[PDB]
Amino acid sequence: RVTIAQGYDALSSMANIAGYKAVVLAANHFGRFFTGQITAAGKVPPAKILIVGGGVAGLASAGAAKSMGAIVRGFDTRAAALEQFKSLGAE
Amino acid sequence: VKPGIPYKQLTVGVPKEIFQNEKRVALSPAGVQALVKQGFNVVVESGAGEASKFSDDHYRAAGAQIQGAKEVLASDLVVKVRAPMLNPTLGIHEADLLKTSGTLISFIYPAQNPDLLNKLSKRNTTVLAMDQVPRVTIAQGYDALSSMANIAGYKAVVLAANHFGRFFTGQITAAGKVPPAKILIVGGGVAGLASAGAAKSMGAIVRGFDTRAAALEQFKSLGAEPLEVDLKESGEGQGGYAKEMSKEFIEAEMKLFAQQCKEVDILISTALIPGKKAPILFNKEMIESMKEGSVVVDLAAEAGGNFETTKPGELYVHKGITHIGYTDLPSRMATQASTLYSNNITKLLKAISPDKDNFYFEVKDDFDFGTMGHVIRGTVVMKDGQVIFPAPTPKNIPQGAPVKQKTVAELEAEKAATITPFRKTMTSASVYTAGLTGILGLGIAAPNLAFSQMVTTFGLAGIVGYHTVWGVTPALHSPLMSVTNAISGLTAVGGLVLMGGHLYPSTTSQGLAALATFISSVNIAGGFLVTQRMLDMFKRPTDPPEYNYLYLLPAGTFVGGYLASLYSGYNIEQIMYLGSGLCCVGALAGLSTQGTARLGNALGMIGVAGGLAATLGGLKPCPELLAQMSGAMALGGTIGLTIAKRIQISDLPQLVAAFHSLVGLAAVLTCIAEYIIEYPHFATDAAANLTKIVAYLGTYIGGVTFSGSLVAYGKLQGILKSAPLLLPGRHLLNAGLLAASVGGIIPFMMDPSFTTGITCLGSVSALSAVMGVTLTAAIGGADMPVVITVLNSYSGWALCAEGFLLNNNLLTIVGALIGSSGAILSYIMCVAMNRSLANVILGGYGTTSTAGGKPMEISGTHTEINLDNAIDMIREANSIIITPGYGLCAAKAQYPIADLVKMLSEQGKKVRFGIHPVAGRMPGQLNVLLAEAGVPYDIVLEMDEINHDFPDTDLVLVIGANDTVNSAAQEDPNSIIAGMPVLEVWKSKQVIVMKRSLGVGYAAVDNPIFYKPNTAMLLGDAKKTCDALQAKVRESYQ
Amino acid sequence: TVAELEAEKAATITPFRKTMTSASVYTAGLTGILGLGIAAPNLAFSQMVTTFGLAGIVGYHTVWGVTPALHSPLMSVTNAISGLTAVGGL
Ligand SMILES: NC(=O)c1ccc[n+]([C@@H]2O[C@H](COP(=O)([O-])OP(=O)(O)OC[C@H]3O[C@@H](n4cnc5c(N)ncnc54)[C@H](OP(=O)(O)O)[C@@H]3O)[C@@H](O)[C@H]2O)c1
Ligand SMILES: NC(=O)c1ccc[n+]([C@@H]2O[C@H](COP(=O)([O-])OP(=O)(O)OC[C@H]3O[C@@H](n4cnc5c(N)ncnc54)[C@H](O)[C@@H]3O)[C@@H](O)[C@H]2O)c1
Ligand SMILES: NC(=O)c1ccc[n+]([C@@H]2O[C@H](COP(=O)([O-])OP(=O)(O)OC[C@H]3O[C@@H](n4cnc5c(N)ncnc54)[C@H](O)[C@@H]3O)[C@@H](O)[C@H]2O)c1
Ligand SMILES: CCCCCCCCCCCC
Ligand SMILES: CCCCCCCCCCCC
């Protein structure tokens, strides 16, 4: 994993696809909305998703869950991945 | 005896659904808290919520009472999801197990099930069909089909992916670019809009199409691409629903769909026409031309289908294209469906019987279109055994036929088309010939050279004062007014020149210009202390230390440079006047970027000291007259310093109204005293007709400035009454006073006696005082800041009066600096509301954008919360905007608010303030009151800077504001505040309004943001509610 | 980056020296005004210095207001109005 060899990194590609597929498999088995609307029929709260460990799959899951409507409160032990979480918009 | 059966002996039952693959429940555990607080007993079957993840413990802890299955159907009000069907686990129809003469709440579909109505008519029961609820304005709360369509539209998008092979989003990865997925949506209803929203949030490209012209507008508002066909046929039928299309239109639409079926990846068809089956829109060869791997979702599989290849209940892969044709999409999300359906049932049972305990539920036949009788008649299918299902016709239907409502900004854009560019250029060219002919008129009437020089320096100083007042920060408009009242205390310069004698005045003309010097030295000390006490409240405690005493170095070089140049035998007064005027300009120019504000007070002090020193050095008095002048200025300054530091800042407008009257008297004292001292010189003079005219006009202007301000003081303190005192005449009286004042200049000329001149000066002073009293008392206590600023202009121009009168060059520059300041402030404040100056003074109705009668009436009910919901909803939010009004500072409630912001900023939120320009009793009052409470100025934003940040805002606290957060300014062209620029607080997630009761402040009889679904009321006094919130935030975070 | 090297120049100027050089600029301007006052032979010179200072401030504010797309028509307009040296020739 170096700078000039990031155009051909198969593990990062499969981690990105696994993160997006974990998000889109979280919904269709979770029986409520992620977004939450204020209609004139009742307040529905957004879903709350926690992501242990932000690498490639963790940040892919944070992006796919944040753009869909939920709020993310992920965590990682490294000090750079928390700044990547804050840049993606998580807690 | 009240008509009805009380809620105590009236129980409800929640049966488990028996239909195949049905997972929903009629009442959630959150939905059996209501219907227990209302009064019903609740009996729930033992396993009714296990499929939708609602445990039995939540039921028996929320207030229900768990029983079996045969005795829950024999309840007084059975509430279930689907129709009562044949029970297979013990052979009996569920209509046989119902209680005799009971009431049922479920989906029925009575036009397709007559035999079930024949079963229910024998048990003498009452039927409320949830699908027969008429779609009117007062019934958004109980609309079950819209909720099921919303859930199906979300589930179709989230079920299209997890079967589609690749991404919806599309991104530029370092491995390579991937394009987004293209999604077609056929039919914009509720499921169509939900599908478009849930597909656009995931980053796809949506290109939906619908026949009705409103649905394409909702497509282009959701961010989609509205398609089009080349045939113009009206898609609408009888109302909001669609109708059957012609065969040629269907063939052209299928041509469009066969054209764009070879490019999309997902397609969702939601087309459903009421009255008959769904239209076939896709052939079996039209759909096989797609890519290998496409997903095709059909949300009309129950009522036919939009495809001739759809098995109506299963998935199958037909030559590489998956067909999702599920008939129960809300049953796959049974938790959200159960919660929304329980909310609809709760709001229905609340709306049909609003009494505390009667449950009367009357069915009528004659009803207005939109009243509760319409809902109760259309919803009830069976009333006490008989079928009354075909509902009668309503009254005169309002019908919403102007769908495109004429919004307020549409009407000014339509008014701008009457302004054809020949008339624009003609009214542009007429203003300039008016101005140049006025300049020629000033040139003809000029007696000498000094008048022409004074007109030139007046025009140049007026342009300088125009540009330097638009440059100030809008957060500093009240230090602007205080420092202009400080600089307008240079009417002492006019008092010193007409001042002579010894220790005491000799003549009455010399005695008037000692009272003038006295009451004009009050303004200087008062304005400079109150400006100094306001500008050091804007100093943040983390700011670097400021050593302002170094500005004693220019002053001692300037004033001390005059005296050393006066001891050496020179005459520097006409250049000291320039230096003093430039320092007064730089006092306002420094009040423009918040870091040079303390510079722009010291420069004004240097200018005032240099002007006074140059006047005293030019006069060269005897040492006994200098003692009189120093005693007068010292006593006036002592009074100014001792009334400028004992007041509170919230009492600042009254003091400002006390500063103009001391100017307005002083001008009247200096014009009259110059008519007396210059009287034996008029015979041997050519400028005698000049210095009389100005001495008339200044005597008018100060006469309006004095008495009007004394009304403006008295209506702010509470001495006078806040209601506009209207007289019978009110226009003939004021027009006669003005005609008498401008026609009394004719006996003042053509008659050179002293007896007839002093009576004309006294007459114009008396008529101007009566005119100020009459014009100011008809305004009302709300529009009173305009009177503070317009008169702030007059005390400017009064200075210019004596600047032309004493041939003094400092007074014209200072007066042109102050009159433009007051004029620009009155303009800003008469633009911040959509009114005009004659609308404010003469008392018109409403504003300039108000049309004729009948403003719109409100719609919906208001939510009310307590302190605990408010603190639980403050805790959840991340970015908070507070919009304060004058109600915050009238209750002295900004001190808990500043500490609340200080606590919530440390926890990691983003708390800001949004200030409207006409909140408060003065321009920029609320900024200085928030600075006094301790708020740093970098989180206090104006209206124009924060009004686009309301969609990205989680919570808005509206505190003491009614009209500046009103939405009727942008929607209703008949309203009282139409076209007014307002804070758009309703465009956020949630708004908490804190006020005493549901009333009005000044106008706008009901505020329609209070009845929106995202606004909660927090009724109570603002002081106790704000410091109770402070106490909760303190005791919960420590 | 270059703004990060400009930050240590913007943060090494003490709050005393900013106020000291500002008060120095204003005291130099005021003593220059006094110096123009002493050298005045008559009243027409004082009136002309007054209209000169006011017209200078008007010209300062009015040419920051022009659109940056019209700076060369501004140049052309000032060259057209500077042909009023014919007034001095007539
Ligand atoms: N500022 C200026 O320069 C200027 C100039 C010209 C005109 N005006 C006028 O000033 C008005 C200002 O409007 P605004 O939006 O600031 O307020 P507003 O429309 O005047 O009404 C104040 C609101 O605060 C509430 N309130 C009052 N005292 C309260 C207290 N102690 N605790 C809690 N709530 C309290 C009132 O309702 P409850 O009594 O029901 O609680 C009312 O809803 C403008 O509409 C305009 O007419 C101002
Ligand atoms: N162009 C580049 O700079 C580039 C490209 C590709 C990869 N990378 C690097 O390679 C890594 C990519 O991550 P990946 O997903 O491929 O690797 P991975 O599969 O090992 O990620 C596992 C994640 O879990 C985290 N983790 C480990 N133990 C944990 C614990 N006890 N609690 C919580 N979290 C824990 C790790 O920090 C890591 O983020 C990163 O370090 C990234 O900087 C960089
Ligand atoms: N304020 C109000 O009065 C108000 C507010 C909201 C909703 N409503 C009502 O609710 C309805 C919501 O729609 P719905 O989802 O309940 O209806 P629905 O279930 O019938 O939706 C089917 C959609 O397909 C469209 N369609 C029909 N034939 C078509 C064809 N041949 N080609 C393409 N599209 C076709 C219809 O116009 C409709 O938009 C509105 O139409 C309106 O009547 C009223
Ligand atoms: C006598 C002719 C002039 C009348 C007006 C006196 C000066 C007022 C200010 C002029 C410019 C607006
Ligand atoms: C820089 C502005 C002019 C400075 C003038 C200094 C004093 C000159 C005196 C000339 C003889 C009266």
Side-chain angles (χ1 to χ4, degrees), chain B residues 174-189:
Chain B
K177 294 187 264 76
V178 290
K182 295 180 175 67
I183 296 173
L184 180 61
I185 303 297
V186 177

Side-chain angles (χ1 to χ4, degrees), chain B residues 135 187-190 210-212 240-242 250 253 270-273 279 281:
Chain B
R135 290 178 177 175
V190 178
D210 193 355
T211 62
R212 294 183 292 117
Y241 289 160
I250 294 299
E253 186 179 2
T270 64
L272 184 62
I273 297 169
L281 295 173

